[PDB]
Symmetry: D3
Subunit: 231 residues, 6 copies
Amino acid sequence: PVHILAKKGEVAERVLVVGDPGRARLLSTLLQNPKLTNENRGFLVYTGKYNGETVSIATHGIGGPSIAIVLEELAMLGANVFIRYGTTGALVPYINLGEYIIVTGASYNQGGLFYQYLRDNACVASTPDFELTNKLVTSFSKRNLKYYVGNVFSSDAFYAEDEEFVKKWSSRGNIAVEMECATLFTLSKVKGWKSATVLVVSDNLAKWITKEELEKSVMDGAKAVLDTLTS
Amino acid sequence: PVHILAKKGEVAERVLVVGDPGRARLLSTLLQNPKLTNENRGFLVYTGKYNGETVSIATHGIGGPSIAIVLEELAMLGANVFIRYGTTGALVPYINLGEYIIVTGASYNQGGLFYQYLRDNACVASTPDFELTNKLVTSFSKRNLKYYVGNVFSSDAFYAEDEEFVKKWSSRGNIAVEMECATLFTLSKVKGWKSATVLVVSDNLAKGGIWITKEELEKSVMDGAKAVLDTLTS
Amino acid sequence: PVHILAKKGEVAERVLVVGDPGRARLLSTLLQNPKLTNENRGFLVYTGKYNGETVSIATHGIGGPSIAIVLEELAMLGANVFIRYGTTGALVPYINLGEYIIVTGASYNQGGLFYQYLRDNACVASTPDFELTNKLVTSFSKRNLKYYVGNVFSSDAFYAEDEEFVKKWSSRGNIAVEMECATLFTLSKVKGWKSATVLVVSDNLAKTKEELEKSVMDGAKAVLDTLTS
Amino acid sequence: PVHILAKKGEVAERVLVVGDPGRARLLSTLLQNPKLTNENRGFLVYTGKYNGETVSIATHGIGGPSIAIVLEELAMLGANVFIRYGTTGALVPYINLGEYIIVTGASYNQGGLFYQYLRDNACVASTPDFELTNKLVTSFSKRNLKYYVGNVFSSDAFYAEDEEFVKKWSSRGNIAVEMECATLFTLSKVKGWKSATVLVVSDNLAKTKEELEKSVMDGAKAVLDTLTS
Amino acid sequence: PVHILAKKGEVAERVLVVGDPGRARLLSTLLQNPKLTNENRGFLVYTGKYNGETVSIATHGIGGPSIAIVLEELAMLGANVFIRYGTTGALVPYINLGEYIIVTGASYNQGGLFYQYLRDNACVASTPDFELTNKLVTSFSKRNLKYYVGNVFSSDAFYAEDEEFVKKWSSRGNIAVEMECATLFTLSKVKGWKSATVLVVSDNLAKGGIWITKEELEKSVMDGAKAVLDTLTS
Amino acid sequence: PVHILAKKGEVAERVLVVGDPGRARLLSTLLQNPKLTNENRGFLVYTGKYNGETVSIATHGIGGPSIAIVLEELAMLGANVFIRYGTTGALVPYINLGEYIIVTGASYNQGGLFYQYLRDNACVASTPDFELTNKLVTSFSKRNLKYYVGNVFSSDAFYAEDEEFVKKWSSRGNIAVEMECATLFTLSKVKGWKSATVLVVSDNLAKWITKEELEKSVMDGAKAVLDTLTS
């Protein structure tokens, strides 16, 4: 590896990946005896225990290219189970802020990364591991957390303009929008890794919350994700 | 509806769709008082009772263009829950004939039908209804049937040649190949229908030697059908 | 062949293909001593004689994927000449219902089937066999049938929406729309089969049952003449 | 028109188009009282009579972009019937140098010109006018000229490398390769022009100057007959 | 070489390529002892002296397919430095007729010629030789000629209709439109040739009212030509 | 903005963007009175003076999606001149480690980000600002720095496998490989920003160096870039 400078044995098999470095650190406090195993290029990687199991919490930055690089290196260091945990903008009105979304599939625009990996333009099903996603569902319900199940659209251009964004993607079976799921799912399915994703709705593009309520929402969801990784 | 000619209220909200009209007829015998509600253009459709619940079994033919037409007209006639039941060929050497595959997504080569519907080449997630697929899983394990869970590649060219067919598709997360799932899944997400699929392994491209007998297969078809009908009428 | 379970030699070298099983059975009435050589998966195939030639009438269902499968297996059974006969919707106001359209080429949207067969996205000329199409012209000319010669658009999504459908495809040199010609022609070109197509206009997207019936039947006779021409 | 500076009415309604300026001048010798109606940018255009009809002979240079520009402006000048006459390389071993190929369709690779005109990537049927191609058949038949009927591949890169060129395009139903047919046909279909094409085989990619010359000239006479048919 | 029929050593290493054969002839008069080295298929090629240095002026016709053929045969005959000189239409309202545009890159709709050469649809950087373009800049400012520097869109369809043509291409960093630069630039990078381009604004699509006189333009053509020839022979 | 939390007036018009947060900080010492104006999501943004001018040094992370987001927000805060400064792998043998590459164009694979921004698949010329790139050249030469001028290929999948990588991209006019230039150039040309790029060769895929020599190389190049931004 060349971005994640941790050494083999400092990265657990089970990994909770987040886009923000500040969140990884913040969430590292939910672990027993948290240890910073990397900080190169800003990709903070924490390792510790939870429910008598070794778990890592890594940063993947923003975008397909970035997370693809982080997954590849975490895997080279032993990781083979990934659960992305982030925030997202909902594409449907009936979903409120602070509630969660367990991802079942990712729509995406063809090209770049996908072309380079898939070697052609075929639309390979971009889905998470079935077992692991069901385990996520069981966890969130066990903790009485309000969650919705559906596909998301993984966008590459946050600021690109599209006058029909919400209608287009919502009418295409997508209930929210983020940026890494398509790369995570497809890359996982190719490399043989088990992956899933849970998102915190921080905005509704089709229809508010305090910073406290949100972090509380992020915290509750994290315990559910961490439970699943060690279940 | 110009292909399926059924009157008002002949098609049920829940529908088991198969490609073979013969299988549709054969499976209609598991229902109570099965009545033929359409036979136009060869698309046999039966409506009957199962566990005291009303369901329909319809023929969709082969290929996306065909199943799209059948699904669109069926929904027009009142259907909104579809469970495709058909045959497939495994792409992994660890799956035996007669066993079942519960579809979790569908890969596909874009263009054709998708372009006309999506108005562009975006790769929209082609997945089945999450809940419904779980019901099928519960149903199949409750009837102690051996099944695997994963994605399938929906081919449009049965006889097209590809020297790397198996390694390509199985390395892309697909454990089997069939021809209708991508269209069913994607079309469903757009129109708002609840769909899912269960396939019976009739061949294995990762081992083209083993084989199944007429009765062994048909027995394997009947078994799965009951599980599927339990789900549709649960 | 896993779909068309006809015996080898039980399928004529010359075949008239139609999308609906009902029509294949109805048109078999035009053969001498018609025999059902297959009924698997609803794909009815009848084999008999017309004039001094053995001829088959096969069903291909709806859609490129369906007709490709049928074409492939009929060939493995000895078929090398195919003439598709079906219904279609005109894209121009000057063609009346019941009139015929002799197909000269097919427009299509880049697709999986073409990609799987062609291996890339080239726009290969999707045309019928030149001689066969001219013989059809001669045949429909002899029986004094009103026909128009032109290209059609092979749609893959019957119910897909497009507010400019008629204008877009008619200004692109297409006078009608159906669903199997592009697959037929192109596959035929790559495989070496001689193929052609004549359609009966059952609708005009720009503008009686006996009206059609007789139209269908008369057309079939004209086609069978050509097949045994 | 900024390229073909011919006066309106100085271009016949029927036009024979060739890629090389030398040939257009050489074939004008076949017209009655030939007049040079344009020579701008090297695009020589001659107008005269053949039989009882006014006919023009225009140059289009090499490549889709070039012939589209010429076709567009000739039309703005009154042309609606175009017959391209050029050289070509066979993709099959059974066609001899000097023999002719009457074009039935053109295969092409998705491109800018097609995209700019069609507005999307659909594979629109790129074929000649059915009647015009049959008249050419009749004409080359009367003058007893050996011709073959089929599709060609319109390449955009003469020197682009492809170790499987011959096999790829010949197994896709193409018996020859040239560079302007696809543009001609498709543009003609969208614009409403009647177009056709006959090529003289000057090379075989699978297998005397007077040999060709006479071949060229004889072909031109056959084409002019058709143009004034 | 089947299009350009010149003997051994008739084409010079440095070459000024124009699309119009007439302009090629007209510009050959600025050379010393200009000799016609080819006229086959209308592609006039002249070889002569400028500032005691040997250069050639060749015709390439209209469009990428055409210029590709001419460039490939010329290089075969010994050429390896190309400077295209032609006309263009501005896409910005601040550029007047008779002024010049020194090309820094070329936009294009993929497919056709590019696919056959690149073997796929990657968008390879279509740029001119950096050094050579700077020489042209020095040359033009040294002759006090008004010029702008930027990218151009290489169209394959002169008469294709587009209701948003100008705003689309000018909003994408293109200050003009022509038909050959993309092919020249991209082909050059692949074969290893040194290329560049200078265009004379003969029209402005952001203001289709103003206009230039025959002599005013030809004078503007001759002026730029000298600057270009200084560069090729420097 | 939502990623770069700096306030309007804390981001200069002139900006030196780098992929690594640690480099931005390291390079901030070349400024007069450096001030950290943002650290949200790990995108460190420093502002200070150089040659009597206000300059910012920002982090853009890895990948088109990431840098596109950072440019968009820096611009919303006043930035309109960007010079990317990073490391790269050379595609040609004659270039040695530690030497520099002034970028004149970026090749890229179609799709994603480009499709979303350009609204179609056209290959828009992805080039830097002509003036600014020449000024970069003048700077590097004024400091006797060994540099090469050419196009680079902006890859989206660092770990994607391609057996013909080097031959393919080198024979296509590219002398090096990185990941952000195509997005930077094209996005700049559309938004009206003036951009350029200079790269440090840290590897040669077609044919070594110490960490000291490299940082020394990174430092020398930075002074040249900073000179250009204030020239």
